[PDB]
Amino acid sequence: DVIKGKDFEITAKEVYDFTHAVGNNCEDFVSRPDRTMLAPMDFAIVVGWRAIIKAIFPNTVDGDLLKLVHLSNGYKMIPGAKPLQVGDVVSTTAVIESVVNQPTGKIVDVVGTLSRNGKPVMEVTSSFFYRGNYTDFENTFQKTVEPVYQMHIKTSKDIAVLRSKEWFQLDDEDFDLLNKTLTFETETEVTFKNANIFSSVKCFGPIKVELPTKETVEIGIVDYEAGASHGNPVVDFLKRNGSTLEQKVNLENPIPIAVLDSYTPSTNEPYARVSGDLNPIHVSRHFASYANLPGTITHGMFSSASVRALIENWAADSVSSRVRGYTCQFVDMVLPNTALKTSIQHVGMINGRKLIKFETRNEDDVVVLTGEAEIEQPVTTFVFTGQGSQEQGMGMDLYKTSKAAQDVWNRADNHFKDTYGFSILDIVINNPVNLTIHFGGEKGKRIRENYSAMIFETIVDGKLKTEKIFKEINEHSTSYTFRSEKGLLSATQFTQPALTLMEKAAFEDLKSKGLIPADATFAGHSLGEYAALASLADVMSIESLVEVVFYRGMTMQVAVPRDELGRSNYGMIAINPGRVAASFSQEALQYVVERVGKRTGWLVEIVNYNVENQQYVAAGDLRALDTVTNVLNFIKLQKIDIIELQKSLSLEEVEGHLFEIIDEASKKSAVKPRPLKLERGFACIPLVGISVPFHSTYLMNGVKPFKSFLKKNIIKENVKVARLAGKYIPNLTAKPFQVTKEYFQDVYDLTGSEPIKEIIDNWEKYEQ
């Protein structure tokens, strides 16, 4: 029977008394204004201790409570559950888990669960020891909640293995399981006739299938029944053939965090009062002598909570919220008036939460406790490098070592060989100056067919002009030659996928070593945000990602068709507004760039807002890049502010005074020929390796094809909102990803569109 404890309201007095009854120095448990007074998770037992002990009494769980020395206790928050606030109202319910009659006595496992607002918030797992000999084969039972294993059905010889297993009952017996991820809500009850052989096996629980839209459905039932069992074959099956959802990764070398001197107080009276553990053994020497022990034993859970303070102090960076778990295994016993030298080690890392392993030493150099501790650090955020930063043999050091890199690079390169008949891994490794893609053979025809579908859908006066990329390639073309001046890796079509893959392979190596919290934010440097997005969210598959970035790279190579060499009369420049003048802010830079671009009649705009009043990357016409370079050379030398003179001298006369300087600069900037170099200014520094004018006005035509591609290559089945929401920060709209009328209306303001305006008007239809 499920036991229920009295609904115990949390107060600020009881928590304030407990921060001295353990001696906690964490300031997140002190009573101060504005910020909440969070409960230390070690206080959760004070709520549930009453109910947990109520499960150990029953007349079919019998043993000497004096010879009951607590074995192991924990605290685990369920996922998402916030830890307990100051004023919270927390109810307790517990059930006794397993009655295991060990040869040395009887370990009884108790599972308590605390509930706030109606919902669970933390579960307390404990084991206790009635020592002696327990012919308790009738009163025993095992009732454990087996881990949700998965099993991937990639192949038909292995679905035949699963179907041979009678326990896999299907609702639709014809349901094609192939190319799916089943999960198993297994919970196993077992009676024992002996201390090893089981009396009867009970394996039941529904079986689900993860659907592409990530909404599972119960397609089967596990139902395994037998007599004289020696082990659950179901769980034994899923142990080898299926896989555990969570696999903790460890370090090469565990981090020796510290070994801290915690002193046990002479008295165990101040904590026995606040804990409800009246047990005299801790205080009463006469009781402590009857137990055969060498005096008034320190409260175990007091040694637990004292080490928890140290785990929160030096492994959870002194924060209440971020610590997730805390277990303590009772090894030995320690008295009052000891200097416990607790050996804390960071051994593991799992999915954001740091695995912290400790054993407790005294002055006597012996171990009295062990235990674990989960601590999330949600304080990670990712920034991804853009173009130009590529070099020959990049991400090959990571390639030869990691499997997470290897499998990424290999999958991409196999995709590229089989799709476009070339090796991104060949290019990166040895940077061939030229690459000849041969369309000879049935491979070569199916490659050429892929090349034929690469098309600019560029709007020209409210009508699409679908102009093929590499026009030459047609149904009679035999072999095309990709050409570079120095090394194709340098050409953007290959820079973009190579960079995006190396940054995906590095981030997938961190997934393999699990150093990445699941609630970190991210944003990327123009192209970088494609890597970040594929990385943190899994928005694009590896084959999707490389294709879309390749298509971008083709769109951006022939966005502006060039001369024979391939010298686009376009580019970029990274401007320090402080260089020209400190008073010359971001409002004087956007005013002077818009006034030079309207007069000179050429294109120049601000495309990256990198650093606040230190870096703004401005792209457009290369003569409109060297004439604004000379405009911030001439304003710097003259020390003449435009924001002073436009308000504090004359209204719009400075705009008529800015023509004549722009007319000076643009009549010396129109002299230099077309193959002109962008020569560094006193205010500006020209960008190297970027001949394309990315994010300028020059590629306003080629937005509609890039949309058409992102409509054919982002499928909503892959896209989830949970994994994005709060984290995803676009480059244009520097806001958290929100699925609201606030964000639809703020994106329609920046750059209006027919499908965002259709959703804002029809938002009330899609509300319900």
Binding site: T385, A523, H525, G528, V703, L732, T733, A734, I756
Partner: protein, 94 residues
């Protein structure tokens, strides 16, 4: 709000942001005022073969946050993968 509708709306919202950020200016000034300030993120990693966003997030903090980072008892670690991997993997030299 329905899951199949919330999937359609998030799919169109992202698709249009990426289709336009393609050819749109990158407001990285306010991007560094989404996480550095508003979400008190502690550890920033730069994924790439050279640090560019590294000197960017560090000089944003020195300009606007040197009095906001020292007044709330927090250590901002601006890291690049290719330069500072040791700190990532937790693989120091003893």
């Amino acid at each position: 709000m329905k899951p199949e509708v919330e999937q359609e709306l998030a799919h169109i919202l992202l698709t249009e942001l990426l289709a336009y950020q393609f050819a749109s200016p990158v407001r990285w000034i306010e991007t560094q005022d989404v996480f550095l300030k508003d979400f008190n993120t502690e550890r920033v990693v730069e994924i790439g073969p050279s640090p560019t966003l590294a000197g960017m997030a560090q000089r944003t903090l020195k300009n606007k946050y040197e009095s906001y980072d020292a007044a709330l008892s927090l250590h901002r670690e601006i890291l690049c993968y290719s330069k500072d991997a040791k700190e990532i993997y937790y693989t120091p030299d003893p």
